[PDB]
Amino acid sequence: KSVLRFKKLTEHAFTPSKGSKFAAGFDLCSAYDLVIPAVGKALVKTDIQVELPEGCYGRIAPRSGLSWKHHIDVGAGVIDRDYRGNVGVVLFNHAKTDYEVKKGDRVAQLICEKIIYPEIQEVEELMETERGEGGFG
């Protein structure tokens, strides 16, 4: 099977969890209390390191309730497979008031997005799409 391995860097780290088996991502909980300033930003530390399963990367995706109700956006969000440092959640507070994040509050979710790891190859040929010059048929 595919396994997502993690390790708590401090006692403040929380075990990522889902509500159902087919939930898109594991909820990431804030390991500390912090305030994201109005029209500002903050880097939320999860105090965990992850080892992603093969054939994917880790996308830090937003949660619907926190984004819609509190005007919070998730920046960055790309977790490379070989990254073993502290997983940080970049949050943009677009509201005119400060937002109070508490320890243990689920601020985002980690989705193991299947991707292709291809080789890059430069061509001299000018590429052009088939559609057009012909129409329906």
Partner: protein, 143 residues
């Protein structure tokens, strides 16, 4: 559901298809297609997808033609489909090949209509216009 029978019958004849050839693509019987085109049998939303693949036209364009039927009682786009077909090919080439269109477009159908109205305003024939000139007019509509 509001004139879809006329849409299929008109577009089937525009693409030079027999009732049988469309029947052989869709999987619908010739009798089912005949009742669809005349108005006896109503066409569900899942049949337009099947008819769209059989005709070679995106199904969403058939929905937009139906909206003109609901709005005017007739479809000017369907009345001049030959010019729409030729102009829709130009917007598709420009949308997928020029960044000025790809990063500013909203709807290829609506933008195809606007270009058609600007050629008619300027007395320019579609079959006569070039793609490179059409590309500039597309970039003008998309400020």
């Amino acid at each position: 559901p509001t004139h879809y029978g006329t849409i299929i019958k008109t577009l089937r004849k525009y693409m030079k298809l027999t009732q049988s050839k469309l029947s052989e693509r869709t999987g619908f019987s010739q009798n089912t297609i005949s009742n669809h085109e005349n108005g006896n049998r109503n066409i569900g939303v899942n049949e337009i997808e099947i008819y769209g693949k059989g005709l070679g036209i995106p199904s969403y364009i058939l929905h937009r033609i139906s909206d003109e039927f609901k709005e005017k009682g007739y479809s000017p786009t369907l009345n001049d489909f030959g010019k729409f077909d030729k102009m829709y090919s130009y917007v598709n080439k420009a949308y997928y090949n020029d960044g000025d269109i790809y990063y500013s477009s909203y709807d290829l159908y609506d933008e195809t209509i606007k270009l058609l109205e600007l050629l008619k305003e300027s007395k320019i024939n579609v079959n006569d216009i070039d793609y490179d000139y059409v590309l500039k007019l597309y970039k003008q509509i998309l400020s």
